[PDB]
Amino acid sequence: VRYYNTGTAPMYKVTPTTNLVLDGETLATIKAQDNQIGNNLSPNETYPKKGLSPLALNIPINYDQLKKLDSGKQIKLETTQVSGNYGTKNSQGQIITEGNSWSNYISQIDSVSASIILDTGSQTFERRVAAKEQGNPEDKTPEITIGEAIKKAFSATKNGELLYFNG
Amino acid sequence: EDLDTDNDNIPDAYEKNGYTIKDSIAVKWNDSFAEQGYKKYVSSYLESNTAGDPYTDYQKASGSIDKAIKLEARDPLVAAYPVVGVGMENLIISTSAYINANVRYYNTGTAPMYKVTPTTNLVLDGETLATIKAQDNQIGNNLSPNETYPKKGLSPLALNTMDQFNARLIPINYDQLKKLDSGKQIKLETTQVSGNYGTKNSQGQIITEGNSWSNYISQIDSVSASIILDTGSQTFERRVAAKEQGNPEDKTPEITIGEAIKKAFSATKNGELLYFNGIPIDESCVELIFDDNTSEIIKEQLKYLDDKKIYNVKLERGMNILIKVPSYFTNFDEYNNFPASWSNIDTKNQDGLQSVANKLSGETKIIIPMSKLKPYKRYVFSGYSKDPSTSNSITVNIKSKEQKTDYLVPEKDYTKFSYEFETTGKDSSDIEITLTSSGVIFLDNLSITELNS
Amino acid sequence: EDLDTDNDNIPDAYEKNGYTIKDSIAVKWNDSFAEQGYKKYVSSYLESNTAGDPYTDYQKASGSIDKAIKLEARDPLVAAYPVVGVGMENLIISTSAYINANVRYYNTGTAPMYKVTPTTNLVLDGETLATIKAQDNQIGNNLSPNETYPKKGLSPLALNTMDQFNARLIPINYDQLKKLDSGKQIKLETTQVSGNYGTKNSQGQIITEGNSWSNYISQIDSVSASIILDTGSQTFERRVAAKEQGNPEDKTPEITIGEAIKKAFSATKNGELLYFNGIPIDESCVELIFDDNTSEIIKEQLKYLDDKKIYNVKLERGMNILIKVPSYFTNFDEYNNFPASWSNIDTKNQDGLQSVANKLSGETKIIIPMSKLKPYKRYVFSGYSKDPSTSNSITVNIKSKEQKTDYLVPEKDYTKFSYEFETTGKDSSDIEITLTSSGVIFLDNLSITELNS
Amino acid sequence: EDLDTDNDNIPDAYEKNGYTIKDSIAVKWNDSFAEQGYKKYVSSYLESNTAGDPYTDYQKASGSIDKAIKLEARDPLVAAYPVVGVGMENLIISTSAYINANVRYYNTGTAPMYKVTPTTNLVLDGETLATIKAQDNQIGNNLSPNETYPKKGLSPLALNTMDNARLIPINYDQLKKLDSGKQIKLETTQVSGNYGTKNSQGQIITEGNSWSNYISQIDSVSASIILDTGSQTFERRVAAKEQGNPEDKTPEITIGEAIKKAFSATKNGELLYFNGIPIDESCVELIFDDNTSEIIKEQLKYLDDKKIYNVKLERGMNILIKVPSYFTNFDEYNNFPASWSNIDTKNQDGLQSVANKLSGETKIIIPMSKLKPYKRYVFSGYSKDPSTSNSITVNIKSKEQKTDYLVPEKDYTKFSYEFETTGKDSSDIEITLTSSGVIFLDNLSITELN
Amino acid sequence: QVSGNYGTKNSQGQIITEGNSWSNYISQIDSVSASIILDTGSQTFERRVAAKEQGNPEDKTPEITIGEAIKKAFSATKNGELLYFNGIP
Ligand SMILES: [Ca+2]
Ligand SMILES: [Ca+2]
Ligand SMILES: [Ca+2]
Ligand SMILES: [Ca+2]
Ligand SMILES: [Ca+2]
Ligand SMILES: [Ca+2]
Ligand SMILES: [Ca+2]
Ligand SMILES: [Ca+2]
Ligand SMILES: [Ca+2]
């Protein structure tokens, strides 16, 4: 395998959790514990980096799955969750990424942001953009169009009235 | 002029135009200080760590950091970075079967890395047989810059553990050994390394327990431009900070490629020539190699610059650079390491790049033995050509695995030409290099450069 | 004039011109204090630690450190480096098979090491069988300088623990046992040692838990010169701080090699003679072995100095110096340890190195028995000759495994000569050493020392 | 006069001229405090711990420390050492094979060692079978001075754990060599313990404290003294000064006064009593190491008094005081089952009260029942002969017959010779000496050795 | 039983979920609150509204009728005189 990132912020101490769903029924909820952990995973980069042999992770298969896989079916490895860390500055000035987690804020970021996804055909990106719930009057999150949300998420360029992304 | 925006004990006026530390306080840079040996530092006045490295601008300029840090890492633009690799010394596999590997870690950066525990990969052919992490037996307590663990004269450590608490290497089945006998070798690459760094705390000691380099690898890689210098036997890897493209609030200084190479290696410059350890690293005396993106930027930047030299291009964020000193170098002025002398050479000239040129009347032939040539290797022949006439055609005949016959069109001024050939076999046919000139042509800085095989 | 840049309770005026400690406070050095035993200390005023070791210049000078640190380490210019290495004493081979070893840790530095955890390599021939790190059973709580663990009189601690906790050590296959029967020995070398030092807290008790030596290894090595002394039966390693060559901001004191040896060993000096513990270590009375860098450095520095004395050369960072006391040395003045009397020796002279020389008229021949000699070892012939006439040639006939016959041309003044020969076999041919002189020559300080096998 | 350089709440002048502690404050010494039982303490005014043990000079003198610390260690010039050893009681071996050892930790120093965790070595001859540490089961919670774990009357604790894995010889050939008649010796290499300090709440904590931190410091600035009484053996360390340092303000004391300080001995004018056993210079045998003997002979000729106990103590010497098992003085002690021959007590030239007026020869028939076979012995005595004209020869039966001649000097002269007795069911020991004329004998001793 | 944590911001701001177990306030929430459950056929919601003590005069928990409990617990909207829960009355 090879862990891939499509977000905006690096993840340190990456320990992904996946299951072998075998296109119809799960087999094993594999976890990468000690030597498959990625020390750091930068945005739009994979562990290992480009140019290195695939990361190996170390289960029966029945004869029935063999036929179905041979007839118009494919295997996928969905991810249930990934536990990592993130960088926080200090008064002493060091970046401390132990203890800090990317699981405390995930259900906070997720419930207040409107997912926007763009695919260029070769590399995929996912951005979250904050938005406001209708009921709460005290809420003060600004309300902007999708066009402003597209340009502020993928850093396009507004030449005239059309959006240019990497040309 | 007493302001301090970023709180790093350097005034913004002194931080913006040039400064140096005298007796642990910053003073304005004066051009008369270069004769006392002092250096001129320039940095950004909005960031405490200009390069992203653990130590701030004040600590890097004043030298109050780990004493193993190289002196070229004292520039606030160059990042203190351990570049640690694992080189395989021997491979042992025996009887199912058990495989034992001996490794010796190599450091090439500018910072020591205490408590190194590199993660290495065991790959035979595409398949990663096992991803091994270092146990208590195999952890390097120290790794000084440009040194190995275990040090020279010592046997390398053996790597034979699956997991912690005394595990053993073992291939899963007989398939691995069956294809091993076919004639396949095993490579060794490292995916990641983990270590520590030292910071002198308030109690005067050095602590390397609450510190790790992993926190800064991603940050250093994203604000700095990679530069490599290769000396044939030794390799060096540095990182030089550069400003973001479209950023109004970024204040990282702009410097050229030549100046950055001078800064990142502390290579002295005697007016114009640049020497690292007595080995020239001048623009014309070395062969530069770039990746895909780097080549595009320089070519675009060249046409708008009058001098038209690689070393005058402003450094940016993100490029990859490689510098390989040519293995055999002749300049007819101060260096001739070729085992065999060239043919039809005339040193009486004054139109060379540095001192003289070589006027050729006819052709030049050179006989190179394979005794001092590395077998099964790829080489590239390089040199400079000048012809005021611009009316003579030059053809090259090179003997190799495949004979190369190409034509060259000389220009009005000196121009660099590159020709690549591949030779295989130590006990093969003798390598022949032939070049002919229609009239009178000038030669200077002829070199043969080693490349990946 | 109480300025303190480094804030180590020693004003810059004192630390640059010389200072000594009285009533635990620093006072200006005055030449009259020498007779009372007060020593002169000089250090750098821009660093709290001039030498780089865990203790400051004030704590090292005033002695407020661990009481097991030697006196000569209290010099601010001498670091407290513990050089710990293991001693492989015995083998146990029996059933694959099982291996058991007895080892005894050794210390030869200046400061003790608490909680020693050596790492050991079991190398047979090229291959490394296994890397062993110390267990809880083999962690030595204490280790005094120039001492052992276990202390003298106790049997060595066993080495049969493969990994953390304990698993029995075992060769992986029969192949190594096969070549072991041929007569291949097993060697042990120390790749690293991890240990603690000892400081006091704010409450006065020595805490040694979180402090580790592996931090202050890279710093001290790359800031100080390496000095070794071998006394035949023991060895003493010392590291002395030296200034950087090109730094204008470094204010580390510079001292001669002669004074460096005096400080790093606390060697008493009665004018010009140097004594370690009653054994002279003067430049003329001992021979030195250097590496490549120091050899070319020392030769270049001689021609600019009129006296041309090794002990009078400034110490610069990085040099490696080895001092091996002569095993058999005669000076015809106060020492002659050769078992057999020399031939044709005249003590009636006044042109010797110190008091008298040898008035040799003809040849000198010596018969050396093997009773007090080490077989399978190399020795180097050393001595001094004087021939103002410069008209007599001297040839030497030394019997060895290969017969050596070389000619010598002595100079007008005293000159040292070096000759190499190897002795092999205890029950072998007697070693014959003979030298002939055309006329009358002067001889003094004839030395014989043991080298590697 | 109230300056305190070392910050240990003791004024500078008091610590140099002698001080004593009353009402938890430091007061200047007076000779009038002797009759009340107060002690005279003198120490160094520049260091927090004059001796080098973890307790400061004020704490040792005032007694504000752990209460199990001996009365002989309160004096600042005496270190607080937990000399802990391991002794093996019984050996169990059975099926390769397994070995069980019964051990019992012994303490002989001047302080307790909590959480004793010794490391041992199993050797048969040169080779070391294993290096056993103390697991969770084999740790002594408390080890008070002169008290062992397990305490008196309890069976010794077992020892058969090595990692976990049960203790085992690495091969069968060890059994083959053990059956040959070769035993196994157990020796200790180190020991890990903790010391108690009063936390700010008034409670005693022994978790972060440890002794191994404070061993190298105390073993480097102390002179080692051992007192052996055949049954109970004590070890003490006394702080001394550095020979080549002017800043060293450690007070210098003689060997004799240190022995008073180290064991808190009582003085009846000139005689020193340990527990009713005299430890005077002439009544004991001293076995020095090679280093000390060379140094002692140097100051011996430079002193007019010419007594060993008046020699100034210096850092780095070892002393061993061995109380003789058999001693006589013709005044107040005679432990011999059989009396001498031709002995006259009517004299006034003795060392303390009287001497032995011998006219001829003296022979003693010592029974074997009260002597230890397979042990080395040295006989002691003092010879005085103003005439200096009589030669004395000794004929003592032993494993090898010994015949040596002695020339007594004008004054009392100490003589000692080495002999070995082997075999329980061997010949009875015969001791005979002849004198040409009239000689003076006093303080004859018989001592066991190593 | 189930074990887990909750998240309360701290002095610096970063959410801490390490020592903040849920199981400390379970035997307290079940002892001061009335259990109310609403089922819609597809998914079921569970809420626990607070209720005062019977005879404790120091208990100042507000008194609200069951009609307000359902409106508060599920954020129901009152149209006319009917409680509307996302279309479904
Ligand atoms: Ca600033
Ligand atoms: Ca800055
Ligand atoms: Ca030229
Ligand atoms: Ca100072
Ligand atoms: Ca200083
Ligand atoms: Ca002489
Ligand atoms: Ca004191
Ligand atoms: Ca005091
Ligand atoms: Ca008497």
Side-chain angles (χ1 to χ4, degrees), chain B residues 283-305:
Chain B
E283 189 272 332
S284 57
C285 314
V286 74
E287 202 50 25
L288 306 178
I289 304 169
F290 316 81
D291 46 331
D292 52 318
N293 260 339
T294 307
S295 66
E296 173 207 74
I297 279 181
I298 300 149
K299 276 177 210 62
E300 192 257 348
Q301 201 74 44
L302 264 180
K303 56 170 47 62
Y304 307 142
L305 188 153

PDB file of all heavy atoms in Angstrom, chain B residues 283-305, unseen atoms left out:
ATOM      1  N   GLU B 283      30.856  27.778 -12.549  1.00  0.00           N
ATOM      2  CA  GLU B 283      29.723  27.466 -13.411  1.00  0.00           C
ATOM      3  C   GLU B 283      30.147  26.640 -14.618  1.00  0.00           C
ATOM      4  O   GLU B 283      29.457  25.689 -15.000  1.00  0.00           O
ATOM      5  CB  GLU B 283      29.039  28.757 -13.858  1.00  0.00           C
ATOM      6  CG  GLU B 283      27.721  28.548 -14.580  1.00  0.00           C
ATOM      7  CD  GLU B 283      27.898  28.362 -16.074  1.00  0.00           C
ATOM      8  OE1 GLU B 283      28.884  28.892 -16.624  1.00  0.00           O
ATOM      9  OE2 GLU B 283      27.053  27.684 -16.695  1.00  0.00           O
ATOM     10  N   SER B 284      31.273  26.990 -15.236  1.00  0.00           N
ATOM     11  CA  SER B 284      31.715  26.302 -16.442  1.00  0.00           C
ATOM     12  C   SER B 284      32.526  25.045 -16.161  1.00  0.00           C
ATOM     13  O   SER B 284      32.661  24.205 -17.058  1.00  0.00           O
ATOM     14  CB  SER B 284      32.542  27.254 -17.310  1.00  0.00           C
ATOM     15  OG  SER B 284      33.643  27.774 -16.586  1.00  0.00           O
ATOM     16  N   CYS B 285      33.056  24.884 -14.951  1.00  0.00           N
ATOM     17  CA  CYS B 285      33.931  23.767 -14.624  1.00  0.00           C
ATOM     18  C   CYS B 285      33.182  22.566 -14.066  1.00  0.00           C
ATOM     19  O   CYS B 285      33.804  21.535 -13.792  1.00  0.00           O
ATOM     20  CB  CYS B 285      35.004  24.213 -13.630  1.00  0.00           C
ATOM     21  SG  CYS B 285      35.802  25.778 -14.045  1.00  0.00           S
ATOM     22  N   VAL B 286      31.864  22.667 -13.895  1.00  0.00           N
ATOM     23  CA  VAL B 286      31.070  21.598 -13.306  1.00  0.00           C
ATOM     24  C   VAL B 286      29.827  21.395 -14.161  1.00  0.00           C
ATOM     25  O   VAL B 286      29.398  22.287 -14.895  1.00  0.00           O
ATOM     26  CB  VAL B 286      30.687  21.910 -11.842  1.00  0.00           C
ATOM     27  CG1 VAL B 286      29.615  22.976 -11.786  1.00  0.00           C
ATOM     28  CG2 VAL B 286      30.249  20.662 -11.117  1.00  0.00           C
ATOM     29  N   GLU B 287      29.255  20.197 -14.070  1.00  0.00           N
ATOM     30  CA  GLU B 287      28.069  19.836 -14.836  1.00  0.00           C
ATOM     31  C   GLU B 287      26.861  19.829 -13.909  1.00  0.00           C
ATOM     32  O   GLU B 287      26.806  19.039 -12.962  1.00  0.00           O
ATOM     33  CB  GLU B 287      28.246  18.472 -15.504  1.00  0.00           C
ATOM     34  CG  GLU B 287      27.346  18.222 -16.713  1.00  0.00           C
ATOM     35  CD  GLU B 287      27.368  19.343 -17.748  1.00  0.00           C
ATOM     36  OE1 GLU B 287      28.369  20.085 -17.832  1.00  0.00           O
ATOM     37  OE2 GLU B 287      26.389  19.453 -18.516  1.00  0.00           O
ATOM     38  N   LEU B 288      25.893  20.696 -14.192  1.00  0.00           N
ATOM     39  CA  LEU B 288      24.698  20.836 -13.376  1.00  0.00           C
ATOM     40  C   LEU B 288      23.564  20.002 -13.955  1.00  0.00           C
ATOM     41  O   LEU B 288      23.367  19.957 -15.172  1.00  0.00           O
ATOM     42  CB  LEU B 288      24.261  22.298 -13.279  1.00  0.00           C
ATOM     43  CG  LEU B 288      25.294  23.313 -12.796  1.00  0.00           C
ATOM     44  CD1 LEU B 288      24.701  24.708 -12.801  1.00  0.00           C
ATOM     45  CD2 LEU B 288      25.771  22.953 -11.411  1.00  0.00           C
ATOM     46  N   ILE B 289      22.821  19.342 -13.070  1.00  0.00           N
ATOM     47  CA  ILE B 289      21.697  18.492 -13.438  1.00  0.00           C
ATOM     48  C   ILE B 289      20.473  18.975 -12.675  1.00  0.00           C
ATOM     49  O   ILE B 289      20.563  19.286 -11.483  1.00  0.00           O
ATOM     50  CB  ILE B 289      21.984  17.010 -13.140  1.00  0.00           C
ATOM     51  CG1 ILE B 289      23.263  16.567 -13.849  1.00  0.00           C
ATOM     52  CG2 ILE B 289      20.820  16.140 -13.568  1.00  0.00           C
ATOM     53  CD1 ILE B 289      23.761  15.222 -13.407  1.00  0.00           C
ATOM     54  N   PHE B 290      19.338  19.046 -13.362  1.00  0.00           N
ATOM     55  CA  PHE B 290      18.104  19.550 -12.784  1.00  0.00           C
ATOM     56  C   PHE B 290      16.971  18.579 -13.084  1.00  0.00           C
ATOM     57  O   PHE B 290      17.074  17.731 -13.973  1.00  0.00           O
ATOM     58  CB  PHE B 290      17.754  20.942 -13.327  1.00  0.00           C
ATOM     59  CG  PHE B 290      18.921  21.890 -13.390  1.00  0.00           C
ATOM     60  CD1 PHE B 290      19.818  21.841 -14.443  1.00  0.00           C
ATOM     61  CD2 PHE B 290      19.110  22.841 -12.405  1.00  0.00           C
ATOM     62  CE1 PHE B 290      20.883  22.714 -14.503  1.00  0.00           C
ATOM     63  CE2 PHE B 290      20.172  23.718 -12.463  1.00  0.00           C
ATOM     64  CZ  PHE B 290      21.059  23.655 -13.514  1.00  0.00           C
ATOM     65  N   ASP B 291      15.882  18.710 -12.332  1.00  0.00           N
ATOM     66  CA  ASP B 291      14.690  17.908 -12.576  1.00  0.00           C
ATOM     67  C   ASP B 291      13.823  18.604 -13.625  1.00  0.00           C
ATOM     68  O   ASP B 291      14.251  19.543 -14.301  1.00  0.00           O
ATOM     69  CB  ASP B 291      13.927  17.666 -11.278  1.00  0.00           C
ATOM     70  CG  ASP B 291      13.758  18.924 -10.456  1.00  0.00           C
ATOM     71  OD1 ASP B 291      14.627  19.812 -10.550  1.00  0.00           O
ATOM     72  OD2 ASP B 291      12.751  19.029  -9.725  1.00  0.00           O
ATOM     73  N   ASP B 292      12.584  18.134 -13.779  1.00  0.00           N
ATOM     74  CA  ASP B 292      11.702  18.673 -14.810  1.00  0.00           C
ATOM     75  C   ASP B 292      11.354  20.136 -14.547  1.00  0.00           C
ATOM     76  O   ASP B 292      11.517  20.989 -15.426  1.00  0.00           O
ATOM     77  CB  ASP B 292      10.433  17.827 -14.898  1.00  0.00           C
ATOM     78  CG  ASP B 292       9.764  17.636 -13.546  1.00  0.00           C
ATOM     79  OD1 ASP B 292      10.482  17.395 -12.554  1.00  0.00           O
ATOM     80  OD2 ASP B 292       8.521  17.730 -13.474  1.00  0.00           O
ATOM     81  N   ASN B 293      10.877  20.447 -13.340  1.00  0.00           N
ATOM     82  CA  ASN B 293      10.378  21.791 -13.073  1.00  0.00           C
ATOM     83  C   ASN B 293      11.508  22.811 -13.026  1.00  0.00           C
ATOM     84  O   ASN B 293      11.337  23.955 -13.461  1.00  0.00           O
ATOM     85  CB  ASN B 293       9.586  21.809 -11.768  1.00  0.00           C
ATOM     86  CG  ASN B 293       8.088  21.771 -11.998  1.00  0.00           C
ATOM     87  OD1 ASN B 293       7.605  22.117 -13.075  1.00  0.00           O
ATOM     88  ND2 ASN B 293       7.345  21.348 -10.984  1.00  0.00           N
ATOM     89  N   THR B 294      12.667  22.419 -12.494  1.00  0.00           N
ATOM     90  CA  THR B 294      13.767  23.368 -12.350  1.00  0.00           C
ATOM     91  C   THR B 294      14.272  23.842 -13.706  1.00  0.00           C
ATOM     92  O   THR B 294      14.606  25.020 -13.876  1.00  0.00           O
ATOM     93  CB  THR B 294      14.906  22.735 -11.558  1.00  0.00           C
ATOM     94  OG1 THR B 294      14.395  22.207 -10.329  1.00  0.00           O
ATOM     95  CG2 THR B 294      15.961  23.772 -11.244  1.00  0.00           C
ATOM     96  N   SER B 295      14.335  22.937 -14.685  1.00  0.00           N
ATOM     97  CA  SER B 295      14.840  23.305 -16.003  1.00  0.00           C
ATOM     98  C   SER B 295      13.963  24.364 -16.659  1.00  0.00           C
ATOM     99  O   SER B 295      14.470  25.267 -17.335  1.00  0.00           O
ATOM    100  CB  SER B 295      14.934  22.067 -16.891  1.00  0.00           C
ATOM    101  OG  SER B 295      13.648  21.541 -17.160  1.00  0.00           O
ATOM    102  N   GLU B 296      12.643  24.261 -16.486  1.00  0.00           N
ATOM    103  CA  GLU B 296      11.746  25.236 -17.098  1.00  0.00           C
ATOM    104  C   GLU B 296      11.989  26.637 -16.554  1.00  0.00           C
ATOM    105  O   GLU B 296      12.033  27.608 -17.319  1.00  0.00           O
ATOM    106  CB  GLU B 296      10.289  24.830 -16.877  1.00  0.00           C
ATOM    107  CG  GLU B 296       9.288  25.880 -17.347  1.00  0.00           C
ATOM    108  CD  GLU B 296       7.972  25.829 -16.588  1.00  0.00           C
ATOM    109  OE1 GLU B 296       7.939  26.268 -15.420  1.00  0.00           O
ATOM    110  OE2 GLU B 296       6.967  25.365 -17.166  1.00  0.00           O
ATOM    111  N   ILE B 297      12.152  26.765 -15.235  1.00  0.00           N
ATOM    112  CA  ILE B 297      12.250  28.088 -14.623  1.00  0.00           C
ATOM    113  C   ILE B 297      13.515  28.801 -15.085  1.00  0.00           C
ATOM    114  O   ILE B 297      13.483  29.981 -15.451  1.00  0.00           O
ATOM    115  CB  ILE B 297      12.185  27.979 -13.090  1.00  0.00           C
ATOM    116  CG1 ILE B 297      10.733  27.842 -12.633  1.00  0.00           C
ATOM    117  CG2 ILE B 297      12.830  29.186 -12.437  1.00  0.00           C
ATOM    118  CD1 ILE B 297      10.569  27.752 -11.135  1.00  0.00           C
ATOM    119  N   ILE B 298      14.646  28.094 -15.082  1.00  0.00           N
ATOM    120  CA  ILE B 298      15.909  28.725 -15.457  1.00  0.00           C
ATOM    121  C   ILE B 298      15.872  29.190 -16.907  1.00  0.00           C
ATOM    122  O   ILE B 298      16.323  30.296 -17.228  1.00  0.00           O
ATOM    123  CB  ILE B 298      17.086  27.770 -15.201  1.00  0.00           C
ATOM    124  CG1 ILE B 298      17.149  27.387 -13.724  1.00  0.00           C
ATOM    125  CG2 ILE B 298      18.389  28.406 -15.644  1.00  0.00           C
ATOM    126  CD1 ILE B 298      17.697  26.003 -13.482  1.00  0.00           C
ATOM    127  N   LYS B 299      15.339  28.358 -17.805  1.00  0.00           N
ATOM    128  CA  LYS B 299      15.270  28.741 -19.212  1.00  0.00           C
ATOM    129  C   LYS B 299      14.422  29.991 -19.400  1.00  0.00           C
ATOM    130  O   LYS B 299      14.793  30.895 -20.157  1.00  0.00           O
ATOM    131  CB  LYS B 299      14.718  27.587 -20.046  1.00  0.00           C
ATOM    132  CG  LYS B 299      15.765  26.571 -20.457  1.00  0.00           C
ATOM    133  CD  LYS B 299      15.144  25.416 -21.218  1.00  0.00           C
ATOM    134  CE  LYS B 299      15.930  24.137 -21.002  1.00  0.00           C
ATOM    135  NZ  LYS B 299      15.924  23.739 -19.569  1.00  0.00           N
ATOM    136  N   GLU B 300      13.277  30.060 -18.718  1.00  0.00           N
ATOM    137  CA  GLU B 300      12.460  31.265 -18.782  1.00  0.00           C
ATOM    138  C   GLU B 300      13.197  32.456 -18.188  1.00  0.00           C
ATOM    139  O   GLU B 300      13.129  33.568 -18.724  1.00  0.00           O
ATOM    140  CB  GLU B 300      11.134  31.041 -18.058  1.00  0.00           C
ATOM    141  CG  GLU B 300      10.103  32.130 -18.303  1.00  0.00           C
ATOM    142  CD  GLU B 300       9.984  33.093 -17.139  1.00  0.00           C
ATOM    143  OE1 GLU B 300      10.534  32.790 -16.059  1.00  0.00           O
ATOM    144  OE2 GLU B 300       9.340  34.151 -17.302  1.00  0.00           O
ATOM    145  N   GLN B 301      13.911  32.243 -17.084  1.00  0.00           N
ATOM    146  CA  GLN B 301      14.595  33.344 -16.416  1.00  0.00           C
ATOM    147  C   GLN B 301      15.826  33.805 -17.183  1.00  0.00           C
ATOM    148  O   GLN B 301      16.273  34.943 -17.002  1.00  0.00           O
ATOM    149  CB  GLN B 301      14.989  32.930 -14.998  1.00  0.00           C
ATOM    150  CG  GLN B 301      15.236  34.093 -14.060  1.00  0.00           C
ATOM    151  CD  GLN B 301      13.950  34.773 -13.641  1.00  0.00           C
ATOM    152  OE1 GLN B 301      12.964  34.113 -13.317  1.00  0.00           O
ATOM    153  NE2 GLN B 301      13.950  36.100 -13.652  1.00  0.00           N
ATOM    154  N   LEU B 302      16.386  32.945 -18.035  1.00  0.00           N
ATOM    155  CA  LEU B 302      17.629  33.281 -18.721  1.00  0.00           C
ATOM    156  C   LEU B 302      17.421  34.362 -19.773  1.00  0.00           C
ATOM    157  O   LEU B 302      18.231  35.290 -19.886  1.00  0.00           O
ATOM    158  CB  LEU B 302      18.229  32.029 -19.356  1.00  0.00           C
ATOM    159  CG  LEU B 302      19.294  31.316 -18.526  1.00  0.00           C
ATOM    160  CD1 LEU B 302      19.805  30.090 -19.260  1.00  0.00           C
ATOM    161  CD2 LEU B 302      20.430  32.268 -18.199  1.00  0.00           C
ATOM    162  N   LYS B 303      16.342  34.264 -20.555  1.00  0.00           N
ATOM    163  CA  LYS B 303      16.155  35.172 -21.681  1.00  0.00           C
ATOM    164  C   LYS B 303      15.965  36.616 -21.244  1.00  0.00           C
ATOM    165  O   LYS B 303      16.185  37.527 -22.049  1.00  0.00           O
ATOM    166  CB  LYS B 303      14.964  34.721 -22.529  1.00  0.00           C
ATOM    167  CG  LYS B 303      13.661  34.595 -21.760  1.00  0.00           C
ATOM    168  CD  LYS B 303      12.479  34.382 -22.694  1.00  0.00           C
ATOM    169  CE  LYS B 303      12.776  33.306 -23.728  1.00  0.00           C
ATOM    170  NZ  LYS B 303      13.038  31.985 -23.095  1.00  0.00           N
ATOM    171  N   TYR B 304      15.560  36.852 -19.999  1.00  0.00           N
ATOM    172  CA  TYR B 304      15.392  38.204 -19.488  1.00  0.00           C
ATOM    173  C   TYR B 304      16.638  38.721 -18.781  1.00  0.00           C
ATOM    174  O   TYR B 304      16.646  39.871 -18.330  1.00  0.00           O
ATOM    175  CB  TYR B 304      14.200  38.261 -18.528  1.00  0.00           C
ATOM    176  CG  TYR B 304      12.923  37.710 -19.113  1.00  0.00           C
ATOM    177  CD1 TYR B 304      12.042  36.979 -18.331  1.00  0.00           C
ATOM    178  CD2 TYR B 304      12.602  37.913 -20.449  1.00  0.00           C
ATOM    179  CE1 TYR B 304      10.877  36.469 -18.857  1.00  0.00           C
ATOM    180  CE2 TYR B 304      11.436  37.405 -20.986  1.00  0.00           C
ATOM    181  CZ  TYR B 304      10.578  36.684 -20.185  1.00  0.00           C
ATOM    182  N   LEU B 305      17.686  37.909 -18.689  1.00  0.00           N
ATOM    183  CA  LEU B 305      18.910  38.279 -17.994  1.00  0.00           C
ATOM    184  C   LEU B 305      20.032  38.403 -19.017  1.00  0.00           C
ATOM    185  O   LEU B 305      20.192  37.534 -19.882  1.00  0.00           O
ATOM    186  CB  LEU B 305      19.248  37.248 -16.914  1.00  0.00           C
ATOM    187  CG  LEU B 305      20.389  37.500 -15.924  1.00  0.00           C
ATOM    188  CD1 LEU B 305      20.123  36.750 -14.635  1.00  0.00           C
ATOM    189  CD2 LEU B 305      21.718  37.073 -16.481  1.00  0.00           C
TER     190      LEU B 305
END
